[PDB]
Automatic annotation (TrEMBL):
InterPro entries: Cas3-like_dom (IPR054712), Cas3_C (IPR041372), CRISPR-assoc_Cas3_HD (IPR006483), CRISPR-assoc_Cas3_HD_sf (IPR038257), DEAD_box_RNA_helicases (IPR050547), Helicase_ATP-bd (IPR014001), Helicase_Cas3_CRISPR-ass_core (IPR006474), P-loop_NTPase (IPR027417). Pfam families: Cas3-like_C_2 (PF22590), Cas3_C (PF18395), Cas3_HD (PF18019). Residues 24-221 form the HD Cas3-type domain. It comes from the Bacteria. This is CRISPR-associated helicase Cas3.
Amino acid sequence: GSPVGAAGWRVDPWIFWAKWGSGPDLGWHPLLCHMLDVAAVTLQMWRRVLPAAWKARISGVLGVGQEDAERWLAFFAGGHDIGKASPAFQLQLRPEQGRELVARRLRDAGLPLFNARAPHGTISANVLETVLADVFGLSGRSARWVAFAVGGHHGFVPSYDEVRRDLDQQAVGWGMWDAAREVLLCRLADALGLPGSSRPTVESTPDAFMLAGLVSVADWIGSNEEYFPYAAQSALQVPQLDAEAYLERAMRQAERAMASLGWVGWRPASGSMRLTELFPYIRQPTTVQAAAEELAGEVKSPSITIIEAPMGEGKTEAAMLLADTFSTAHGMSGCYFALPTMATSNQMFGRVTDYLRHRYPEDVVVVNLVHGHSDLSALLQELRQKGEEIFQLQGVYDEALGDEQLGAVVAGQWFTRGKRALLPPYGVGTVDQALLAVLQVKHVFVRLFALSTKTVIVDEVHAYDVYMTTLLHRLLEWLGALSVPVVVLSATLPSARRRELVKAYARGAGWQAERDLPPAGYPRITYAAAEDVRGIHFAPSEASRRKVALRWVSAPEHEALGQLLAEALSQGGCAAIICNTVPRAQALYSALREVFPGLAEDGMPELDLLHARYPYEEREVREARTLGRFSRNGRRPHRAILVATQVIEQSLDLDFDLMVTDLAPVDLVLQRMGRLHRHPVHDPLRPERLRSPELWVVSPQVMGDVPIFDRGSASVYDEHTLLRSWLALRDRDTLQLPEDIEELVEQVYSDGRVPQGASEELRSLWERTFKAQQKVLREDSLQAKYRYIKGPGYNSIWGIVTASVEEDAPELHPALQALTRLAEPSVSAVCLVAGSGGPCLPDGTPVDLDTPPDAAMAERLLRRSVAITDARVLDPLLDVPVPKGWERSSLLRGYRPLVFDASGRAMVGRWIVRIDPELGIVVESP
Ligand code: NI
Ligand code: NI
Ligand code: NI
């Protein structure tokens, strides 16, 4: 019973606040200004950033024309903070920043005051779900969907009960507050020209869901005070503004901010280029590239493509040629390049840069070189490079963080951390960043939205990963719903995997056509579209036709391994030994120092070690040395040995005369084997003993016929898979490539239960390990409701994510990533030295843990960073609090100080942790 009189309808919109300053900044930003800012950011996104296919698709989903869909999207995005016009939010002010002035200001307007609290986004959902219908004429489902999606902007879309049951009425207010919000919303809509345009339809769940990500990003752009200064110079006075002129200035500011981010202006300027043109360095295209070039002329706008060729065949140029065809011919301006988990992004960027120069004006040089990167080195150089190049946020009022500056920090991690690579139209990063889009994590919809504008290339997919997890399948479903073109690259996939992946993308795209996948010989390119489903075989390159000698080194021989290496390398040659874990690599290297004490031509020892567990600058040094020795253009040593973990297995473009590896799932052993004699140019200079390729696998202890895998390998990989791999490999003397790649992988995963007629204990090991594996998969399937987001076909906008909603901000990497086995759980730590006056840099300045670092000091700290993953110290390290200055820093939030003494020792739980100049971080028992 709240009849508002005309005096109540008067109100004056500008009195309400959305942002407020703290200390040096005494000013504040009116809510109508903020809504106009986010709407302006949305308009400029529509006009200068978003790819044409995305605009056409979303306009079609909305059922209206493009200008109309644009103005309405700007309306919803601007309307994201309408819930701030409540007593609960307006009264939030600190007394020292003038809460009383605002209180008198609202009291003069006749607005009732209540001290009840509620997050403003939930309030926004609660008001929009009715007002968007009763006033603006949207259907109730449309109003509801927009209300929830828009109301989720701070991290999670609200649960149904939060909006429609558990929300206190005093927090929202009614009568006068409804009239005030109606006035703000109407002035917003009039500023964007909504009357009397045709009403949009927003009843598609997946689309509303990623649109929430668009809203969050537009709010982040609107939160940069450098580009969006607060309109009110003081708490004492209310600005007298014109909404239209302010919208114009807001549009200029939005264009400037996004220009600073490098989001403009990627105009393809067609164009219609062949593969030799985009990649001049190649002479004769490889057969896979030729088949892709032939495929390119008929590819459909929403489609999935799977490319299976032996490693070194150049699948990436084919993939990029396809993405280029998508951008030029199908309006998909943009691409995310999803590199393998262990892979560093580093070597890959330059290729993308070169492709960009051949398609875009040299403005590329001003943009991607800073922005498409996710590697830490780009962040370091960007920090060293004056001026303040890092985009910065303030006044992000996240409900479940202590304060708005903390919310601004957590939101600004999107411009500091590796996930930043998602944002730009072109970006290169880890596949994990894309895979997170289907986890129940904060701002998943932001990841769905960032992916929604690009074609997606998944580099180096392994059979083991698509067998052990469903992450890629789910992501493919969501990508299919959002009409995102996808190219998956792999050395080989079992047919069941190709089928389930293509079926996942098709299931997401709604392709009701059910007709079968066409079988084709390896190597091959599978392809699928609406009316089209192809399977194209092509001939392997003659260079791919090799015989690889296979050799086992058993447990009794395992310390003769140094001797076997000595005889094999007596005439020199480059050799690599891939261990499955860091401790195994450190141990093997330490054992190997006696056998190879010599110095290489680069002035560094011929024996070398490479793994991720080093402070980052040391990683840079060791990696530069490794690339310097074993890369295709590198100065190849007469003799060198590299002990390394799987960071070599998936990243660097290396070539070795001899390969040794721990037993692993066969696709991974083959992937490691792809570095063996990788570059033909090195052939003439190879030592005579090593001219015929050889793969040594370290044999497990064998009791009778029953293998006993080492604990580290058993912990890293599924043991049944290790067993199947060992069974498939043990009798072999010679591998016949290309064909043995697909043959071995198909044998290990795809189907055959082959005990082969052996001991009862071996059979028991088979059945037991298989039972454990299946129990793991089944347990992940039953627990899926607590881990994965709902698929695209889910009935309602609410409940796509349920728990731990708005915590905030819940993992993410330490927890959910591990349970879904997206990646190993880990702790980020900064290595420092002990001393009075607190922790120090190694040379030798004191560190202030109590205050956030400046960009230079943060650069120095990040140089000391390392990602600990060893299980023994992981928990005790997490028990160490993140220092209060670091938690208020977007650059260093989540990092843990790790203070070694003068001896390089530090106590961590029951364990000694040691910083070794040769070994890197070493965990050992006292
Ligand atoms: Ni908000
Ligand atoms: Ni906002
Ligand atoms: Ni906000």
